[PDB]
Amino acid sequence: STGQHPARYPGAAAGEPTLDSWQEPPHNRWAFAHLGEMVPSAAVSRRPGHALARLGAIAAQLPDLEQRLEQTYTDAFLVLRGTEVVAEYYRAGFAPDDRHLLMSVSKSLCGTVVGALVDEGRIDPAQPVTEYVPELAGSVYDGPSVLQVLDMQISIDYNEDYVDPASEVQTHDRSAGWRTRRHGDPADTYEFLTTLRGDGSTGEFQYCSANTDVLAWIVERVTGLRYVEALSTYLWAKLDADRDATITVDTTGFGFANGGVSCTARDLARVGRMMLDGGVAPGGRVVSEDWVRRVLAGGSHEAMTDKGFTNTFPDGSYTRQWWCTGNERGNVSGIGIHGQNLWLDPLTDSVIVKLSSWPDPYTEHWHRLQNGILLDVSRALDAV
Amino acid sequence: STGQHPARYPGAAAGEPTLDSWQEPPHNRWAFAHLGEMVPSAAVSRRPGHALARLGAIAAQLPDLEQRLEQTYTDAFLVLRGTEVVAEYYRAGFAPDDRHLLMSVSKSLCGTVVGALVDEGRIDPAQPVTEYVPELAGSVYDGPSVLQVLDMQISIDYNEDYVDPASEVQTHDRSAGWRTRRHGDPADTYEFLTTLRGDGSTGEFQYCSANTDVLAWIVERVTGLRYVEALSTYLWAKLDADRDATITVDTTGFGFANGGVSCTARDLARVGRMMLDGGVAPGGRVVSEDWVRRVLAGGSHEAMTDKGFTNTFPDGSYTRQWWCTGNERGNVSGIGIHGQNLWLDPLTDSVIVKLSSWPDPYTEHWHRLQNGILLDVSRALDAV
């Protein structure tokens, strides 16, 4: 058993409603107002085909920028300098206020919610995961601290060979509803997490999406809120965002914290703005000044042995669900597969959002090109 | 085979993407901007518990109205007199701008899209369904006219005993993704429709949700647009609505035209406003003056043998996806299970929206109470 989880609505039984029960009472009162949470759904537009390029001042310093954005399958691109949008690009067929999947940039949002609860004193990163989720006893998360989950310094047997249905990576997707279920699969994301094992060692960085969903589980046990609501209460609702975000949910209503958030490029930039404002957003403080400093400072360099990162960023590291380049600019970024970045450039008080759809989740090629763009744009913002 | 269907995106192969392919190129460029169409998803609110009752002037004439609304499981209630909102009610936990499932009120919206195409001369109601969807040859829809589908005057072997998985009604839900699939089930809604049979007789009203999905299929073959887009282009985008509507989609992206639309109460009232304005909306004409007159005039009374309707409305009928009461007021309504109405009161130039969640999809009890409320409110709007 995976223990108590936040009810889908006031008074709901565990796991209710399901796809087969949402039309029945008492579920239907909630379900009729939230059907997209149960059944795939399309927007019917209230508004009645060409790329929008407003690259502003940086266009002069980067003459080939639009082409470089096209080449890296850019869907939305936005540069926020201070409080001002100074450059924007949206591909044909993607509107400025359309939402885009964040993939693992979602992790940086989850870490922020954890940070908010640390600020309130409701989570102690030094405590073992099992202090908050006892049901993870007997798993690879039995022993490690919450901080080690935040920094992803837990050794886990987690096959990333996606094409293999036996792989943990595809099983994670199936347990969450991102792929069709196979017989014997865990019922939901919580159950999947409990199946995870490792040799017990910690201290070395291992990028693993399961870590973020454990963080979300901790958030739920501490607050009693569905992660969906916690993400709003502790972050999204304080941003003065233009639109709601969305997040995919599994069959229990648990948000796919590691990868399933979608939002507009402009709204994502508000998260970066908050980080560069010492943790404060328009609607109040989100995380502490100390939390932001720790993110900008980076994690242990010794722990970071991912050559896919360190070949480009030799002094790079990872902490609290953010990638830290350790470059001369101190750049830090949320990153997600297929070319998503929430990129922070503190030197120029700027945030760069790039949301993309590379054909491949990862290649060295794509990251070389993408990082070249983000660094070039960052440098273009320097005083001259 | 069910023939050609509108691609999910420009250049998409038939049936693509699926839940198992949306992360792969070229699908992912579309899917990353529309993930809710593939995977159940929740809103993450940009805004940081008590019923809202603003019953206005009619409160004096109906002292017990709020209680009567509570008793009929009212989620949203709105009265539009002319262009003015004169009364509103929303239950605790349902915001004025929250969207609500329309159930079969969705049918009246679909019929309106058909009417728009009749106005343009692209659909001839006198023509057989097979003129537009040849692949329905050999089915119960081989022979009947488009108008007979519009008026639901086709005899169909369609078991409405929902609890029986063998029933056409539950199979319809499963084929569309409203319920978990069973082995052997049709792949999608189109295929389900082709399995339908009947004795060949026509002319008598038989309420059947399959009819509306056939209308949507015709709309797609005539326009080349996904029904989702057609519903926007020919109706929703002309309403000057506050919010997009949504519609559930099956695995091919086909909108559940018969029952799957959700929208706000205020926006639904704009559809009624258009009907009482001779078919014209803020963004242009939607249907012809003649179409509206035919709806208000009613269908054949001889055809209407549903005692669940005629016991209350002896001179009632059905045409073009609207229920026509034939009462002294000439009331006409869209109706959906669990207490949804888009109710037109031409005498007072008013529209009443009531969106509810009765525990039961239908009982004589609920309809007696609900119709009592709609009639009382209508009469309260009369000049005195």
- Alpha carbons within 13 A on the beta-carbon side of B110: 34
Residue A231 to residue A219: CA distance in whole angstroms: 9
Give, to the nearest 10 degrees, the angle between helix A265-276 and helix A105-119: 40
The shortest CB-CB distance from A35 to any of B10, B248, B267 is to B248
Query: Which of B240, B263, B239 is CA-nearest to residue B76?
Result: B263
Q: Residue B195's CB: how many other CB atoms inside 10 A? A: 13
Torsion angle (degrees, nearest 10) of CA A170, A173, A174, A175: 120
The DSSP annotation for B209-261 comes to HHHHHHHHHHHHHHH-S-HHHHHHHHTGGGTT-SS-EEEEB-TT--B-TTT-E
The token duo for B60 is: 């004096």
Contact list in A for residue B46 (CB cut-off 8 A) is: 232, 236-237, 239-245, 267
Task: For residue A277, give every residue at least 6 positions away whose Cβ sits within 8 Å of its Cβ, in sequence order, or none.
Answer: none
Q: How far is A162 from chain B (nearest CA, A)?
A: 12
Report strand pairing: A245-248 vs A261-263: antiparallel
Q: How far is A26 from chain B (nearest CA, A)?
A: 7
Using the beta-carbon criterion (under 8 Å), do B243 and A45 form an inter-chain contact?
no
The shortest CB-CB distance from B178 to any of A36, A39, A47 is to A39
Contact list in B for residue A99 (CB cut-off 8 A) is: 33
Q: Residue B200's CB: how many other CB atoms inside 10 A? A: 11
Residue B42 to residue A37: CA distance in whole angstroms: 5
Using the beta-carbon criterion (under 8 Å), do B45 and A338 form an inter-chain contact?
no
Residue B384 to residue B382: CA distance in whole angstroms: 6
CB B96 within 8 A of CB B87: no
Which chain A residue lies closest to B31 (C-alpha atoms)?
Answer: A101
Q: Residue A215's CB: how many other CB atoms inside 10 A? A: 26
Is the bond into B6 cis (omega within 30 degrees of 0)?
Answer: no
CB B53 within 8 A of CB B89: yes
Task: Kindly tell me the burial class for residue A360, based on how many C-beta atoms sit within 10 Å of its own C-beta (0-12, 13-18, 19 or more).
Answer: middle
Contact list in B for residue A263 (CB cut-off 8 A) is: 44
CATH topology of domain A25-48: 6.10.250
Q: Is B250 left (phi over 0), alpha (psi -120 to 50) or beta?
A: beta
Backbone φ and ψ of A366, nearest 5°:
-60, -45
State the best of B19, B46, B231 to mutate against chain A, taking most chain A CBs within 10 Å: B46
The shortest CB-CB distance from A40 to any of B38, B233, B238 is to B38
Structure determination method: X-ray
Which CATH class name applies to A49-121+226-384? Answer: alpha beta
Q: Residue B1's CB: how many other CB atoms inside 10 A? A: 8
CB B91 within 8 A of CB B74: yes
**Helix (H/G/I), strand (E/B), else coil: A189:** helix
DSSP E strands, chain A: 41-44, 52-54, 74-81, 84-90, 100-101, 245-248, 261-263, 280-281, 284-285, 317-319, 322-324, 332-336, 340-345, 350-356
Which chain A residue lies closest to B72 (C-alpha atoms)?
Answer: A29
Q: How far is A382 from chain B (nearest CA, A)?
A: 32
CB B169 within 8 A of CB B161: yes
Same fold, B25-48 and B49-121+226-384: no
In chain A, where does DSSP find H-type helix?
Answer: 27-31, 65-71, 105-119, 146-150, 168-176, 189-194, 209-223, 227-234, 265-276, 289-297, 307-310, 364-380
Q: How big is the CA angle at B7 (ends A31 and A172), to the nearest 5 degrees?
A: 50
Using the beta-carbon criterion (under 8 Å), do B246 and A45 form an inter-chain contact?
no
Using the beta-carbon criterion (under 8 Å), do B35 and A98 form an inter-chain contact?
no
Using the beta-carbon criterion (under 8 Å), do A177 and B39 form an inter-chain contact?
yes
State the catalytic residues of A.
104
What resolution, expressed in A, was reported for this entry?
1.5
Distances (CA, A) of A143 to A117, A138, A199, A222: 21, 9, 11, 19
State the catalytic residues of B.
104
CATH of domain A122-225: 1.20.58.710
Q: In what order do the strands lie in the sheet with B245-248?
A: A41-44, B245-248, B261-263, B100-101
The domain locations on chain B are: 25-48, 49-121+226-384, 122-225
Backbone φ and ψ of A17, nearest 5°:
-85, 170
Residue A244 to residue A258: CA distance in whole angstroms: 18
Distances (CA, A) of A121 to A138, A165, B47, B250: 27, 41, 24, 45
Task: For residue A3, give every residue at least 6 positions away whose Cβ sits within 8 Å of its Cβ, in sequence order, or none.
Answer: A133, A134, A135, A221
Tokens 């972050």, located at residue: A235
CB B185 within 8 A of CB B174: yes
